[PDB]
Design a protein around this ligand. Structure first.
Ligand SMILES: C[C@@H]1Nc2[nH]c(N)nc(=O)c2N(C=O)[C@H]1[C@@H](C)Nc1ccc(C[C@H](O)[C@H](O)[C@H](O)CO[C@H]2O[C@H](COP(=O)(O)O[C@H](CCC(=O)O)C(=O)O)[C@@H](O)[C@H]2O)cc1
Lengths: 315, 315, 315
């Protein structure tokens, strides 16, 4: 049995060893919980974004950045892979814990979800849960959580607060852009499960996605970071048994395709948890089926929409 | 003073510390030999694949995976380089030792070849021999080696079985796919030797090759993994003195070029013998000549053949 | 505070633990200075080139090599990024220390610059100074510095020669080619400062640049290594506030744009420090402005000129 919280805790300790280099800052609160700021009152960095992504994926994914071009324009890209896709993506990475503690609101991702069982149905579906006495959570938020928030997280995870760590970054920050593009494989796995495909059948997944420039506020950044995956995110997946249903994985099969994610976000009143989950999906996928030995390709890339989404200005 | 077996054993010790994360399993046999299953009864992983390949190359190469596209279809690629191409590729990685013990048969690669000296003529040519009390072999096989097999290998290496490690994966497995595409530099070096170009003249090489999808059995996989290099493997090589014979390195200069290996092999009725050996070669190379300061490009890529080989189904 | 010398010294100690693997050679001089030959009487290596580049950037950058193609011709590329672009690129990397000790000439780069403050105006512009009592310099030179040269460097940095390290490689060497393409982010940051843009406004930068083949002498190599960046170097940059003057960052906005830099190296008398500093610029940039949330793209790639600089011979 692997422990995503223990593996991720090792990465968080590495992050804390290099705080100044990574442009992050931590604080131990009055109950002993550790809050790591990766973007609210600090700049963060590409490497902090990679480490935050690795932590969200329970330490069970490789994540790196390579610079490449789209129609000759240079971007940083995330390239990543995992051989524990259900656990890394659904059991850890997905932001499946909505944190609401009086006026404090955050989207919660990462290994702590596998202790608190958030949501319970996910852990039934992937047949995984952790048992650790350390909890590691990743918060997408424009404010840092206080003692009361950390005490609530600790309680839900059945751990002491002194054994809770939270990484925190806002949507519009470099760590935000990196970690959200770092969910490229997770988008595919999540969309596959939403359409009824058993994620326990998925053997491995590898993905690439450009890293959104940082737009002027958290709301517009929600749009462009998500469009990175929807219009320009590519996944190679290996599965035990193919299902014709997987033709409906790519975003271009959605009635909302062509729309800026910012549009969809606005209609949900800027509440991420009011977005229809059936809308998150990768631009393109290739699915290697171990049963037939065939590889089925679905989807397409769309630089035109992406450059609109990224507020690119050409000469 | 570089020991490919000592360096490789350190990598194998790492693989042992992370078995469950890598999805591999090890057994210590009655004679003490350690057999590490990287794909027979276990799924393996992309990282087990990279480490397997690093082991094959004696620890003297960098090997990593990046996700990229071919005609927009996503694949995982190996990207690799070495500054010891003779030792890493000829003295270690090449599957140059046919292991035949009763009815057990496997192609052996990796550092143990440099203790067994298999074949002797290679070690004379590259002016390398290892001197070590530990042997690390990598076996491409559908069955794990038992006590008697490991005793045989240890005898041939002159090491006590207690100090022999074998990594094992079948041709159709993720480790199989990764480690075979991870021979992209080795196929250039080996083809260069084959056509009469002294490997001692070769300074370094750096290569890129897509990782084949896993096909439905070892024989089809033998085809697709090899076609990765023959139809879509690229190598940049640096040499002390270029000779025009090197125009013959690319696989496209073989009389047998043009169909997927498995179909060529079908056409030879499973007969190694009746296929031009010059077919085993990279798709394209660029050769930086240190003498003239020119860089000579030969060969081409072939996505059309690659996609037949990979049994790609487009919509 | 981040000490570029203390961090870089750790990289050099790592290089000293793997000399034979990296194909480098070190000597401790009489005064205790450690001279690491990375390319003068030894071959060096791609990995030695990456570590030399990392040391030039003060350990404050990520540097890796990926193999990819330009018009299908395979090359090794540097992919790199930093979140301390003023410190790493201008405070450390730029070769801003002209070394002239009797008959010994070298271009000096690297963290020792931030101890000797060379040139002073740079340290005033970026507001950085180091306080280490170790010094690490990178010399681009075709001969190894002796006891007297290292005495001069140690004195200028206010450190005992026993605590000084020098890395040394000529322009025509693998370490030369890697390290110079490894300045792709720095070329953008330097040009930005040149045209009056405060480098303190620069949040981060990420770049890709092909690694030049080694040409037949240091003079031709000065041309092709530099053309890598000027004709095929791409940079993604983040800044706090955009300024329209940044439209003049790309090399193609210079009067002299269009011919290989080999013609330009002569029209400065083969003196690097005689070259007009406004020609020294990246091929293409994307500038993400945090204020407006827009990303402005300028410049263009030029494979045709690159293949000429590189002395590519196609069939
Ligand atoms: C790409 C996304 N973007 C994004 N952006 C930013 N800025 N930050 C992020 O963290 C992030 N996401 C990461 O989390 C990404 C995303 C993939 N993750 C995500 C999405 C939604 C949620 C919320 C939620 O709980 C989620 O909707 C839920 O887990 C599943 O969704 C619903 O759909 C299903 C409906 O049930 P069915 O009708 O399928 O029932 C079937 C029948 C099938 C049918 O015919 O419909 C049955 O029971 O037989 C249910 O399981 C129900 O839970 C959480 C994470």
């Amino acid at each position: 049995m692997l422990s995503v919280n223990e593996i991720a805790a090792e990465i968080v300790e590495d992050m804390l060893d290099y705080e100044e280099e990574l442009r992050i800052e931590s604080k131990k609160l009055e109950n002993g919980a550790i809050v790591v700021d990766c973007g609210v009152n600090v700049p963060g960095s590409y490497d902090a974004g990679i480490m935050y992504t690795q932590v969200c994926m329970g330490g069970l994914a490789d994540v790196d950045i390579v610079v490449d071009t789209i129609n000759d324009v240079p971007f940083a890209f995330v390239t990543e892979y995992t051989d524990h896709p259900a656990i890394a993506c659904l059991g850890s990475q997905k932001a499946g814990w909505q944190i609401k503690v009086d006026k404090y609101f955050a989207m919660g991702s990462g290994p702590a979800r596998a202790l608190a069982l958030k949501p319970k149905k996910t852990y039934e579906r992937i047949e995984y849960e952790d048992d650790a006495d350390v909890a590691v959570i990743a918060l997408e938020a424009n404010q840092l959580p206080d003692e009361k928030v950390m005490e609530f997280i600790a309680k839900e995870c059945d751990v002491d607060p002194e054994n809770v760590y939270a990484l925190v970054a806002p949507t519009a920050s470099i760590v935000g852009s990196v970690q959200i593009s770092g969910r490229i494989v997770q988008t595919a796995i999540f969309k596959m499960n939403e359409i009824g495909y058993d994620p326990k059948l998925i053997v491995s997944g590898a993905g690439r996605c450009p890293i959104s420039p940082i737009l002027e506020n958290d709301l517009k950044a929600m749009g462009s970071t998500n469009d990175s995956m929807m219009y320009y995110g590519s996944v190679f997946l290996t599965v035990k048994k193919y299902d014709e249903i997987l033709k409906n994985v790519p975003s271009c099969t959605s009635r909302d395709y062509g729309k800026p994610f910012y549009e969809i976000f606005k209609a949900a009143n800027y509440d991420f948890y009011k977005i229809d989950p059936n809308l998150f999906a990768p631009a393109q996928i290739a699915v290697n089926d171990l049963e037939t030995g065939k590889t089925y390709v679905h989807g397409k890339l769309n630089a035109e929409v992406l450059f609109q989404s990224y507020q690119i200005v050409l000469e």
